[PDB]
Amino acid sequence: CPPKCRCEKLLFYCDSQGFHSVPNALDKGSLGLSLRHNHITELERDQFASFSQLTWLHLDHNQISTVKEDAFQGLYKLKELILSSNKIFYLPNTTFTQLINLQNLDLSFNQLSSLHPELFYGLRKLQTLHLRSNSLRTIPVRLFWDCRSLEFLDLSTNRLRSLARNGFAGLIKLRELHLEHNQLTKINFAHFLRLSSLHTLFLQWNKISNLTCGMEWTWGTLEKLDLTGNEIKAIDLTVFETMPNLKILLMDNNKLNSLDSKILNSLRSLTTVGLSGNLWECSARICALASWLGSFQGRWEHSILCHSPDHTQGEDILDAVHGFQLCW
Ligand SMILES: *[C@@H]1O[C@H](CO)[C@@H](O)[C@H](O)[C@H]1NC(C)=O
Ligand SMILES: *[C@@H]1O[C@H](CO)[C@@H](O)[C@H](O)[C@H]1NC(C)=O
């Protein structure tokens, strides 16, 4: 066992040492390697050539800025690779292609601005992919073609401006998708057509104005949709016909004015809803919603208050409806 490193087994724990590069190990058959919280700034070719048998490799919390071609070559048995909390901004197209058994890949908290379309090719056994807290602006149509077994994808806290129109291919088994805290403007739910195993979709804290659906299709597996804190003011009358089994819908902190009876008649499988913090107009228009709320038997965590007109401001939707004879 190499200097400054304590080894519990064939696993090597070299965290918090004053390391500036990967150490040469006498023992080459190590199963794991942890180099957390060091001062590594660069990953060389075949740096891990000695550690062929490595199954997990932790390199988080380093100052890594440059990753050479073939940095991870020869690591066929590696199934977890953590590279979060570094200064990575470019990755060569061949950088992961040898990691054929990889299962968890973590690249969050890096300075990535774009990704080579073929970056993740051949990562068939990948299950979770963490790309949170990066500066990505776009995402290649062909990027996820091969993630045949991915079921968790995190693209939150980035700078995504748009969603590619024809491209979620290869994510047929994905269950949970995080797109929160980006900069999306519109949502066309037809764009998610390929994700036919999704249970949960997080879209909170974007800049979404519109909710539309261009294709008529049925998303039977979607059960939770978090749209909290957007700028939604308009919704196409069929976007929820698409989600018959939707059970949790959160639309707090938006700019919703009203909800059509056509919309609400498609939200009958809900068990939890969120409509607080909006711009509701307590006029004759709100009857569809008022009627829906009384009929409802599920949860809402925060009271849903009227915004307009001035003499209804701050009052419960139902209290205002029955108080002021707005409906029926
Ligand atoms: C990888 O990117 C480099 C750009 O430096 C390019 O020359 C090379 O052809 C690419 N390889 C593949 C397989 O696309
Ligand atoms: C959303 O659609 C409405 C009407 O369909 C339109 O007024 C508005 O410009 C659209 N929003 C965007 C961001 O294009």
Residue numbers in the entry: 34 to 361
Give verbatim excerpts from the published study on this entry.
Neurexins (Nrxns) are a representative presynaptic organizer family and interact with several different postsynaptic organizers such as neuroligins (NLs), Cbln1–GluD2, and leucine-rich repeat transmembrane neuronal proteins (LRRTMs). LRRTMs are potent postsynaptic organizers that have been shown to instruct presynaptic differentiation. Here, we present the crystal structures of human LRRTM2 LRR domain alone and that in complex with human Nrxn1β LNS domain at 3.15 and 3.4 Å resolutions, respectively.
We consequently obtained diffraction-quality crystals of LRRTM2 (residues 34–371) with the T59L mutation (LRRTM2T59L), which should prevent the attachment of N-glycan at Asn57. One asparagine residue at position 57 is located in close proximity to a crystal contact, which appears to be inhibited by the attachment of N-glycan at Asn57. The interior of the convex face is stabilized by a Phe spine structure, which has also been found in other neuronal LRR proteins such as Nogo receptors, FLRTs, and Slitrks, suggesting their evolutional relationship. The repeat structure at the convex face is partly distorted at LRR7 and LRR8. The convex side of LRR7 forms a short helix and protrudes to LRR8. LRR8 lacks a phenylalanine residue involved in forming the Phe spine. Instead, two phenylalanine residues of the LRR7 convex side are found in the Phe spine by occupying the Phe-spine residue position in LRR8. In these crystals, the C-terminal caps of the adjacent LRRTM2 molecules extensively contact with each other. This contact seems to be stabilized by the intermolecular hydrophobic interaction between Trp333 and His355, which possibly inhibits the co-crystallization of LRRTM2 and Nrxn1β. Therefore, we conclude that the intermolecular contact found in the crystal of apo-LRRTM2T59L is not physiologically important.
